[PDB]
């Protein structure tokens, strides 16, 4: 049978991080999978448009940062930006 | 014994705003969907998930439209919703 990739194990890992004794059903996992795919596509499309506007041919972390700033509303965006930066720096150190 | 008009209506409002189920019978809706799709292609098949998704979308759309209709009716200092409220809500939303 052909393998069907999904964001299920990662969503479950995050859920165990946040609520260690709370489970999740199958419909809720489908909804979370759709949410992750939707947000990924939105941010990636905005970043691609930003790259095309400035006559660049590379999607960098600055394009992703500006796409997150444009798309996510208010305080959310700020926190998201922080998290993103917090990752890249760490990734560079190792 | 008999409740005053508008009491059972409020009880039903409170009851159906707590549940999550579908408020339209499944077989009539499936028949309606098949009849509508007959006019585009002949001898079409439907996954069960397709009909369920159509039902969820339609019910959400109708509930939101009725919320806007209730707002329009209250604007005119009324309690009942009339077709003119539906038409105004749809026209402002951009659908007509």
């Amino acid at each position: 049978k052909t393998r069907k990739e999904s964001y299920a194990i990662y969503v479950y890992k995050v859920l165990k991080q946040v609520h260690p004794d709370t489970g999740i059903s199958s419909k809720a996992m489908s909804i979370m999978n759709s949410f992750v795919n939707d947000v990924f596509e939105r941010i990636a499309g905005e970043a691609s448009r930003l790259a095309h506007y400035n006559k660049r041919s590379t999607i960098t972390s600055r394009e992703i940062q500006t796409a997150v700033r444009l798309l996510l509303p208010g305080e959310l965006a700020k926190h998201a930006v922080s998290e993103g930066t917090k990752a890249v720096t760490k990734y560079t150190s190792a | 014994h008999r409740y005053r008009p508008g009491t059972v209506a409020l009880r039903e409002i409170r009851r159906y705003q707590k549940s999550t189920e579908l408020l339209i019978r499944k077989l009539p809706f499936q028949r309606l969907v098949r009849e509508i799709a007959q006019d585009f292609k002949t001898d079409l098949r439907f996954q069960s998930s397709a009909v369920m998704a159509l039902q969820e979308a339609s019910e959400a759309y109708l509930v939101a439209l009725f919320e806007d209709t209730n707002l329009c009716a209250i604007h005119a200092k009324r309690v009942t919703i009339m077709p003119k409220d539906i038409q105004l809500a749809r026209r402002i939303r951009g659908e007509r």
Partner: protein, 108 residues
């Protein structure tokens, strides 16, 4: 060759940096994709998932339940201004509606 360690472990994440990089490369977004873009995207996605899951778990706990169902996700999203703005044009299956009644209709 050293023992292979995932990129998401170096960044300290749970979401997959490698899969996100492959999806960015294969998705026809731009000709080239930088090394730090997948890490940023994975971090942002993990943040959003953690936020919405925390709110949904709180909503489930307030209902004296143990398992998250779509009703709890809808209650989490609709009760939060930023998340409601992010998901304004989104329908959640078997979510229901937020309980409210106009003050005009209540008996006086």
């Amino acid at each position: 060759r050293a023992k292979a360690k995932t990129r998401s472990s170096r960044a300290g994440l749970q979401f997959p940096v490698g899969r996100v990089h492959r999806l960015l490369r294969k998705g026809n977004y731009a000709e080239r994709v930088g090394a730090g873009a997948p890490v940023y995207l994975a971090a942002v996605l993990e943040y959003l998932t953690a936020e919405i899951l925390e709110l949904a778990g709180n909503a489930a706990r307030d209902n004296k339940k143990t398992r998250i169902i779509p009703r709890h996700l809808q209650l989490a999203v609709r009760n939060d201004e930023e998340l409601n703005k992010l998901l304004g044009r989104v329908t959640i299956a078997q979510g229901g509606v937020l309980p409210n009644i106009q003050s005009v209709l209540l008996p006086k």
